[PDB]
Design a protein around this ligand. Structure first.
Ligand SMILES: Nc1ncnc2c1ncn2[C@@H]1O[C@H](COP(=O)(O)OP(=O)(O)O)[C@@H](O)[C@H]1O
Ligand SMILES: Nc1ncnc2c1ncn2[C@@H]1O[C@H](COP(=O)(O)OP(=O)(O)O)[C@@H](O)[C@H]1O
Ligand SMILES: [Mg+2]
Ligand SMILES: [Mg+2]
Lengths: 371, 51, 51, 183
């Protein structure tokens, strides 16, 4: 039979059968209970709208993501999300399909063990396998080397790989991602008068960020230009009218990636954690990693980031090496495409964690040889 | 509606066409850049040999 | 639909912008092809001088 | 038929058919197992890269020479090196070719005996002969006398020869060589 390549993610759940080009169903991972009282009788009001249904009734719900930073903080809601994904968005019972979840690097063990225990006890799948979210993104590019920066919505991690041999001592995981950029944008919009507070209006700020923000090639020059002319002010129409005008908030929101001091984080930007991740590698594979830097994940879709990052790394790196940044147009679904490719391989067909194996060793089987 | 229908269909076809064009051109630009870089490495080899 | 009308117009404009980048990528492809040919020739002459 | 003139050395294995001017295949004698874990499936990753292949993937290997000072300290790796030399760098089966190994002076007997036992049992050559590394270097100069200082990479030895009669009591073998200079 065919395998189910699910990809929990944090912000958008992407799923679909193995062997295709794009995920079959992509929908936000939010579960929102209603918060008001409700007076109409017999309206058929449910107790929790999940997935894309709660992005249409969000006016009277309190949306809450079940995955904070890679890790899962609310297991009941995550189980609900998985149940919805299997039964309503794909309509395939899990009793007859292997599953291939994905997990960020350096995550707590208990999260992974609970994930496998749920998949084997509640949904009762035949066999499931958990894979690191960066190796798949390297599969999708058709490479076999390279250092991949997978800046998702929950957590940004940077896994270097050479000739198929991952370097476990050079993984640099940073917890700044799209959600913190949404919060920072929502916080700097208040400087013009627009106040978004409700958990429903966070979605509106996210839409503003997606449609308007861009990464500046040079920050100081853009700050000077936006403060003199008015060629940058782009307007946007809220879900009820009252258009708003975003000035130099456009390139200040995604600039937080390269200067995490804006949101008070100590660490260095995504332009310098990649160079540090490279320098921890051996001295003889640094040229190949320099030449095959891969971008993935949703948050790396800002217009103009593949040039800013290249300029920064070229500034840091030695002058002789060539710096090349691979930015495929299908960046958002790169991890899932790689997952489909991996699940479609014949050599991989015996790596699944078969159910009888789980019955013999318990949920701690995932840390064992079947990784 | 019919007017909106035709507008929607035509815009969708134009969008898909532009996407396919830019994707294939991106693949082409990748290939030509590979040509350039690999040729440059040949240049370095030749320089070392001559010196 | 009015909003679908604006969406289709914006998507067709996005298609046209992708076509402008299609033109720019075509220019990149052509110039890099010139570079490839020039590199073939220069590498040939360098190897000859090596001989 | 033609003879195989192999020359184990320590640092570079030089081999080729007898009667030519230069060795056919010269490549470092290192065997390096990978040391990291490896996540790509089906990449076709081998368990040991030998010879010149392990000088290109050396970023993720742990290269280790199988010959320390003339003597051979790791017989399995040396057998692997010989197998590679015969089958992939020369592509001639050893069942149809005599071999002429070379050995430093004043080396342990067991090393030489094990070398001949391997060549006769595993590779199954028709006939093999072991020669002292300095007499050959005297052949190449076209002389018949002279004192030759053969400072290899493993061991430096100094064999004096007169009129073809070697003087066994005047061989001065010193274990400083290229490897110690590298260190
Ligand atoms: N076109 C876009 N431009 C800018 N940011 C985007 C775009 N699309 C998605 N994002 C950001 O990326 C996030 C989605 O990232 P995604 O790759 O789905 O995360 P995950 O790894 O959990 O799947 C969204 O929250 C959004 O903030
Ligand atoms: N051109 C050179 N200049 C200086 N040292 C060299 C040069 N070529 C080789 N060497 C040294 O000599 C060693 C190779 O010696 P070689 O004669 O191959 O040893 P063997 O007797 O084992 O074959 C190398 O390890 C290197 O340190
Ligand atoms: Mg992701
Ligand atoms: Mg020698």
């Amino acid at each position: 039979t065919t395998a189910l390549v699910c990809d929990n993610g944090s912000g958008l759940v992407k799923a679909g059968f193995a062997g295709d080009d794009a995920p079959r169903a992509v929908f936000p991972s939010i579960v929102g209970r209603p918060r008001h009282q409700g007076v109409m009788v017999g309206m058929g009001q449910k107790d929790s709208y999940v997935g894309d249904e709660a992005q249409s009734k969000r006016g009277i719900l309190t949306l809450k993501y079940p995955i904070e930073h890679g890790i899962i903080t609310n297991w009941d809601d995550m189980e609900k999300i998985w149940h919805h994904t299997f039964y309503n968005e794909l309509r395939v019972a899990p009793e007859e399909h292997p599953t291939l979840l994905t997990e960020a690097p350096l995550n707590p063990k208990a999260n992974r063990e609970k994930m496998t225990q749920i998949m084997f006890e509640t949904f009762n799948v035949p066999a499931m396998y958990v894979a690191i979210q960066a190796v798949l993104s390297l599969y999708a590019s058709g490479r076999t080397t390279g250092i991949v920066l997978d800046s998702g919505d929950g957590v940004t991690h940077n896994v270097p790989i050479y000739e198929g041999y991952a370097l476990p001592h050079a993984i640099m995981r940073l917890d700044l991602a799209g959600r913190d950029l949404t919060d920072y944008l929502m916080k700097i919009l208040t400087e013009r008068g627009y106040s978004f507070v409700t958990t429903a209006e966070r979605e509106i700020v996210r839409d503003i960020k997606e449609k308007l923000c861009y990464v500046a090639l040079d920050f100081e020059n853009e700050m000077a230009t936006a403060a003199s002319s008015s060629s940058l002010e782009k307007s946007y129409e809220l879900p009820d009218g009252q258009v708003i005008t975003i000035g130099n908030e456009r390139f200040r929101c995604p600039e937080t990636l390269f200067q995490p001091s804006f949101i008070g984080m100590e660490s260095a930007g995504i332009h310098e954690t990649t160079y540090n991740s490279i320098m921890k590698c051996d001295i003889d594979i640094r040229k190949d990693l320099y030449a095959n830097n891969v971008l993935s994940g949703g948050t790396t879709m800002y217009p103009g980031i593949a040039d800013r990052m290249q300029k920064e790394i070229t500034a840091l790196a030695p002058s002789t090496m060539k710096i090349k940044i691979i930015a495929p147009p299908e960046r958002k679904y790169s991890v899932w495409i790689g997952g489909s490719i991996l699940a479609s391989l014949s050599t991989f067909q015996q790596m699944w964690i078969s159910k009888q194996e789980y019955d013999e060793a318990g949920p701690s089987i995932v840390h064992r040889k079947c990784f | 509606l019919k007017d909106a229908q035709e507008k929607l269909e035509l815009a969708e076809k134009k969008a898909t066409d532009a996407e396919a064009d830019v994707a294939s051109l991106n693949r082409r630009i990748q290939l030509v850049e590979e040509e350039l870089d690999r040729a440059q490495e040949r240049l370095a080899t030749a320089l070392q040999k001559l010196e």
